[PDB]
Structure formats: C-alpha cells, structure tokens
Ligand binder design. Structure first.
Ligand SMILES: C[C@@H](O)[C@@H](C(=O)O)[C@H]1CC(SCCNC=N)=C(C(=O)O)N1
Ligand SMILES: C[C@@H](O)[C@@H](C(=O)O)[C@H]1CC(SCCNC=N)=C(C(=O)O)N1
Ligand SMILES: C[C@@H](O)[C@@H](C(=O)O)[C@H]1CC(SCCNC=N)=C(C(=O)O)N1
Ligand SMILES: [Br-]
Ligand SMILES: [Br-]
Ligand SMILES: [Br-]
Ligand SMILES: [Br-]
Ligand SMILES: [Br-]
Ligand SMILES: [Br-]
Ligand SMILES: [Br-]
Ligand SMILES: [Br-]
Lengths: 243, 243, 248, 243
C-alpha cells in the first residue's frame, strides 16, 4: 500500500496543543506514511521552503557563482538580527535570510522563474504576484506530498539543472549530522495569508536508507516555531528512524 | 518662532511605557509644537498613512470612480477579519484594507505613481521596490514634519490633482466628530523594517482654527495600537485644543 | 419583528421615548438597502410643517450652485445687529452658519438667490409643497412652504445620491456642512430646526446615519413649546436608533 | 607570527593521561596554533586519514563513479563488524573500511598513486611498500602541519582533481553538524608500526570562518580512541571556536 494513515502521531500534536501533518516517505520501500492524508495533500504558501528551488535556479543561471559568493546586506535593519549582515548561500539558507533570496528572484526574473518551476513540477507552478515576494504572498502553493516529490528529485540529482547546482543546494540544506543520521532540510513560516503555518521539509540520510519528510503545523504566533523540528523528531523516534 | 519643543508631552509617552513623537501645527498662527524635534524629523515607511496619497492619485486618474465603487474581496482569508469582505473607498480607508490599495497601485503603475508623489513633494518621493508594496517595504520614507506639510496642502485643496479628488479623500479620512471638533486622519502600522512604528496623522477642525497633527511611536507588538490615538488625545487635551 | 415588501411599518413602542419627556412627536426611518420605512405615527410622519432651519440644506445647495457662496471657507461678516442667539453675533462660514443655524446669513443668501430662482430650484428638488409664498428672506419660517418627515427623507435620499439638479460639488459641500457626529460605528449628517413663528412650535432633526454597508435616513419632529427641550430632538432620535439596533 | 605555541592546551592531554599535539589554523587570520610546535611537524604514517587522498584519486580516475556506488563485501569476516557488509563511499569513510580502500588502491595502481601524491604535495610523497597497505605499513609519512596544508587545498577546490571529486570527498568527510558548527574530518589509528598513534584531521566550518585542525596522540591500546575527538573539542572549546 503506497500511502498509509497513522493517527497515533496526532498524540505528538495534541501533547504540544498543536494541529498539523507529518508526511514520511521510505525511499527503499517506496511507501508513504502520514497522520492526516487530507492535510498531507492541502497546499500552502511555501514561504522559506522556497529557498530550496530558488537556490537551485540562482546557481544554475550563475546568479550565484558558488556557496562562498557574498551577498551584501542592503543596510535596512530587519527584526531577525542574523539577517542584518553580509551572507553567502550557506548562511542565507541557515538563517532564512529573505532579502538575499528576494535579490536572487529579481535577477532570475519572472520568465526564467516560471520555466524552472514548471520543469521542477514544483507545487502549482504559479508565480503570480511580485517576482521577489510570490512565495510569501503570491499565487504559489505546495502540499507536503508535493514537497516530498520535489525533494526526491533533488536527492537523486534528477532535476534538469546541473549536478553541481544540486550538490551545492544539498550542502546548503545541511541542518544536523551525527553518528546515527544526517538531516538536510529547510524551515518555513508563512504569515502573510491565513492560515499561518510552520514548515519543515527535507530528508534523513541513514547508512542504508533515506526517509523524506514534509511537515506543516498551525503557527498562530512565532512562540511555537521550535515544535516544527520537535514534533518531526518525536515521529521519527516513534517510527525508530532515529534513536 | 516657527517650531517649539515642549518636552512636558514626554509625560504622556512615559505614562504608557512608550517612546515617540507628537507634532502639532497651529494653522492660524503658522506655528509648530513637538515633544522631540529630533524624532519629528526622522523618516519612516508611511505604511497605511500612504492610503491618503494613494486614494488621491486613484481618484484623479479614474482608477476609483467614486467613494461608492465596490472592490470585491479576492477570497484570500487574511489576518484582519474586516479585510475579508467587499469594500468601497470609505470602508477600505477606515479598516486600512491593504489588498484594495495594492490593486489601486497596480492600476496607477510606477510612472504615474512616481510623478504624482514628486508633484505632492511627498516624503523622499522614492517608490523603489514593488509598485504594490513600496509603502510597506520599498524606498518611500516620510517624517512626522513632512506628513504635516503634505496634509496642509490637502486641507487647502492645493495638491495638483482635482478639487473633487481632494474633497472625496478628506471625506474618506473622517474619523471622529462632535459639537466640539472634527478629526480627519489615517492610522498606520509599519512592521516590515525596523523600527516597527505606529502612525496617526491628520488634523482637528475647530470652528475658527485647524490643528494639524502627525504622531509616530515604537510599536514592537500590536498590543499598543490604541496608544496612537490615546497619546495624541492626551496632547490635544493638555494644549486645550479639544476638551 | 417586521414584514418584507411593506412600504411603511408603524412601531408605536417609540412613543415611550416621547412620553418619558412629557412630549409627543414622530421619528421616521428609511432603510436604504431594504427600501423600507418605519415610524411611530403614520399620520404625523406625513404631516407637513414649516421646515424652519432644515431649509438651510436646500438654501445651502442653491447658494453654492449659483455662486452666492463660493466655498465653505467664504466669510459672511456679521451685519453688526445684536440678536438673541450669542453665536449669531459674529462672522460665519458655511460650516459654522449651518452648525449654529445662523438665520441672518441664510436670509442674505435667499435675497441674493431671489424669488424666481428659489422657486425654480424648489420645483426641480420636488421640495415639500414647493410653495415660497411669503417674504423671500423668511418664507421657510413664516410663509407657505410645508414639508413632512417622509418628504424630508425623499429630498435627503436625492442629496445622498447626488441626484438633485445642482452640481456634484454643491451636493458634496452641503453634505460636509451637515456633518454632526462621527465615530468608528456610525456617521450622522443632519440639520436641526425650530419652527417658532407659527403654532404649533415644533423641533426638527433630519438627516441620515451612514453605516459600513447601509444608510438609514431619518426625519423627526416634536412639539417644542419652549427652547428648554431642544436637546430632546437628538436624544429621542438616538433612543429610536438604539432600539432598532442601527447604532450601539 | 606563523605558528604560536599554547602549552595551556596540555591540560586537556594530562587530564586524559594522554600525550599528543593539536594544530589549529585560523583561515581568516592565516595564523596557526599548537600545544607542541615540534610534534606539530613530526611526520607519522597517515593510516585511515589517507582515505581522504585515496577517495579523491579513486573518484577522479573513475574507480568510484559516485557516492552511491556499492562495494560488495568480499565475504572475509574481519575483526571490525561494520566492515563485514556492502558499503558506498559515505559508509566506507564513516566506518573506515580498509578493505574497500585496499581495492581502490589496487585499481588506482602504483604509477597513478605516485603521480597523484606528487600533484597533491602530500607528506613525503613516498608510496614504497604494498600498493594496498603503504599508508598503514609502507614509507608514506605526513605531519599535522602537512595535513592542514593538504586540507586547505581540498577546502578551496585547489587540488589537481575535478571540482566534483573534491565536493564528493568533502560530503563523505561530513562528521558532525548543528546550529553552531560543521565538522568535516577523518580519523586514523596507526597500529602496524611504532609508535601507535591516533589521528583526527579536518576542519570546523563556522558562519564567518574556517578552523582547520590536525591532531595526533599516543594510542598504545584502542581504549583511548574516543580521545581523538574529545581532546580536539576540548581545545576548540577553550579557544571559543565551539560553545
Ligand atoms: C516569517 C518569514 O519571513 C519566514 C519565511 O519566509 O518562512 C522566515 C522567518 C523564519 S522564523 C522567524 C520568525 N519570524 C516571524 N515573522 C524563518 C525560518 O525559521 O525558516 N523564515
Ligand atoms: C500590517 C500593515 O498592513 C498595516 C499598515 O499597512 O499600516 C495595517 C494593519 C493595521 S493595524 C491591525 C492590526 N495589526 C496587524 N498587522 C493597520 C492600521 O491600523 O492602519 N494597517
Ligand atoms: C427660532 C428659529 O430662528 C430657529 C430656526 O430657524 O429653526 C433657529 C434657532 C434655533 S435653536 C435656538 C433656540 N431659540 C429659538 N428662538 C435653531 C436650531 O436649533 O436649528 N434655529
Ligand atoms: Br533551463
Ligand atoms: Br559537481
Ligand atoms: Br555536505
Ligand atoms: Br491606464
Ligand atoms: Br499649504
Ligand atoms: Br466635487
Ligand atoms: Br465629511
Ligand atoms: Br580510524
């Protein structure tokens, strides 16, 4: 059975007075698991999870030369302190530095952005709105199952952009590594249109398998942001994917 | 003297654990009063105070036919419940309905928007960024002192746009009226660049004088938004402008 | 509750608001969206009285349309004659003249308009019985002109919709000058009147309540033997508006 | 000052009843630090640290097609349980799977192995001994300072192999990652020729700097192997490189 619902994971959302969805994909078995098949297939603004395709396109087009190229702060103080400095691709993805990616999107332009998202089969492929803000308050929407389909292509270097572009973005996605697992992932927090949601999408590399994941959860305030990773890890532990 | 600093108004900011400026202009005496000349001249994003020039331009170019024309809710559920309904110019200005004004700005377009703000001598006249979001996160900046200069021209029908455009916007600015005074004004809340500030700009019509006002204050959360009107009214009452 | 399709529905319960103040009169309401009227007294709702200072609305419109008044800033110099109402004994503009019901300013407008244009304009406006018989500068106080509360509403609806046979500008300036009350829940544009020259002495308040998604037109009059009860015009109207859930 | 001696670091060695050297290189400042200048320049058998150059050569010559290619266990039960199974480049590096790298070395051959170590300026460049064991019991010798020189070239993609080969080996070196730092490194344990020593070589990636490191310590028994990483992290902590 390709897709199975496991409502026992709702206890992790309940425990934290939260509502949301975790989707897992066992790459070896080609099987999916979620607490909520309906919500797994509901589309939301990608917010900063869009930094994964945006990075790939920026690299492929040479808007980003490499992961060391410096993107100057515009000197506007914003409310995430780590944003108010020069960045490279690694630090811009680590700290979700929106203004750096807004500059990439302007240099990419609407025609190339649209073509690339169609070829990626990325969400509804709709860039309507401002080319520098559409993933925040424009027409683009993606479901957790659609995030998994896209991430599997990236994992296997199967996107049409260069192998090099794909390797550099996976390096930039690096979030955690230890003796048991590697996590490559991207957070997002969509606030400009309801419902306000938190994302975490990516994969867990084990010695002998890869588990893809995409989660979103209701996030009425920034107070709950750490629950994005905390709830995913509680599900990964329950399923014995990580110790 | 054209400008005088009255630091006693700081008592009103301090009582509300707040920081900001109130600027008053006595039209009859051509004299200004502020608690803080320095902050009175600091330029900030106008945010929803931009709905005053945006309304004028939209009416002058016929983007808005009249104050009854209905602008249909686009069906995207947003944060402010009153935005999720149809609006005319009157209700759109009352509830600060951004999406309505974003549509006005797109129809106006960057060339006419830029030229109109130059004719108005409006703040730094800089519309850099997205034509539909520059007053939220683009290049435009205006100080409390510069808001007064603009509002005086609107009050006297001295802006280059039609008298009709000016009359309809002043109708739309109506905020409060009783047997003692009329307030025409517009709130704003700038959150996308630091420092987050609240605005209230407009004027008090008396039988035999007009007092222009422009106030802004630090607004780290939405909890303090009522302080924009409350602190301004404390100053107006101290100065015997209103009971 | 009320019935659909009905033109005018009587609600005698509002008489309680008059009786409380040892008074009697009529409130008429018109729901613009629903095209339905309500009154405590179907007979008095339709009784035609001298308009007295409510005439300042059409008088204002005609004076502006003909250029007798240039704009709402033009100063009308006090003629030097000390009258009973202190607020009349000073310079006025259209805004302050309408707020303080400054009869002498409007008498001067009426003489400049003159009988032929005043008559033509009231016919174009379908205003009350359209009769200006009497002194060109006092007919709305002691001449032949008569208007009911329902006819005040008819006229006011045309003004609200800029449908009177004068410039849009004239209509916008007069609606500005009618501004009486505003807050985050409602706006009232209205004009008071006090007919004292011909019995029975009555008080008026006519205008409308602007809501986000509707307009409620109103016209009230009440017996007013002395100026002591003039504040009851607004007070009783607000009791009715509160009862009908039009204002909180 | 090219190299500074900091003997206060010896406290990390004595607290662990151990003797050895840590060498750090601050890439931004082009300055080195060590607890023992003379041992920093002492050349030892590289043992499994040789897996870094061997991986690069194997990739560039196509012995390894990519990091997914499976290297079938030869069926020989060996002392380290994790070696008794199939491996790819990632797991062969993680578990230091000598037999996989011995097969790489036979496929590379003496002539190409020699030319590549000359091209890399690697240690004494001397491969004399068994083509499949010279890094364990042959003539090759490298100091901690020479490990850092070699690693700086790999970090900057300056070795005379392709950018792709360098990017794949740096992926395979991934050891630890969190919100504070990333460590790419390789352990070694030289037991075949006295003196028995342990290695750890690699670097710490920070947001704004890279700290290269090479440590070796006396290792009479396998009981102290965890001290390779533990003593290095005690130094990084003392220098405020990691929290
Ligand atoms: C809020 C929005 O800018 C968000 C996004 O684009 O998804 C940024 C800010 C954040 S969380 C900071 C909280 N800010 C709330 N406005 C992240 C993240 O953690 O990935 N990305
Ligand atoms: C938030 C921003 O759009 C702001 C503006 O553009 O000035 C909106 C929201 C608000 S306050 C509503 C509560 N805050 C939500 N951001 C107002 C205002 O009062 O003028 N306008
Ligand atoms: C009395 C008459 O002039 C009257 C009118 O024209 O309607 C004036 C006086 C007044 S109230 C003054 C009370 N004394 C009246 N004699 C008003 C009003 O309330 O609109 N207007
Ligand atoms: Br392409
Ligand atoms: Br590559
Ligand atoms: Br990596
Ligand atoms: Br056009
Ligand atoms: Br001016
Ligand atoms: Br007009
Ligand atoms: Br008005
Ligand atoms: Br080892």
């Amino acid at each position: 059975k390709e897709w199975q619902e496991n409502k026992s994971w709702n206890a992790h959302f309940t425990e934290h007075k939260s509502q949301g969805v975790v989707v897992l994909w066992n790459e070896n078995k080609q099987q999916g698991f979620t607490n909520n098949l309906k919500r797994a297939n509901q589309a939301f603004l990608p917010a900063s999870t869009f930094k994964i395709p945006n990075s790939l396109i920026a690299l492929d087009l040479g808007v980003v030369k490499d992961e060391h190229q410096v993107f100057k702060w515009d000197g506007q103080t914003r409310d995430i302190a780590t944003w108010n400095r020069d960045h490279n691709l690694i630090t811009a993805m680590k700290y979700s530095v929106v203004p750096v990616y807004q500059e990439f999107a302007r240099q990419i332009g609407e025609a190339r952005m649209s073509k690339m998202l169609h070829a990626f089969d990325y969400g509804n492929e709709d860039i309507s709105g401002n080319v520098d803000s559409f993933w925040l308050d424009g027409g683009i929407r993606i479901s957790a199952t659609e995030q998994i389909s896209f991430l599997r292509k990236l994992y296997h270097n199967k996107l049409h952009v260069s192998e090099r572009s794909q390797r550099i973005v996976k390096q930039a996605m690096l979030t955690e590594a230890n003796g048991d697992y590697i996590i490559r992932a991207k957070t997002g927090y969509s606030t400009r249109i309801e419902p306000k949601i938190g994302w975490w999408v990516g994969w867990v590399e084990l010695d002998d398998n890869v588990w893809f994941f995409a989660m979103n959860m209701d996030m009425p305030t920034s107070d709950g942001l750490g629950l994005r990773q905390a709830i995913t890890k509680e599900v990964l532990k329950q399923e014995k994917i990580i110790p």
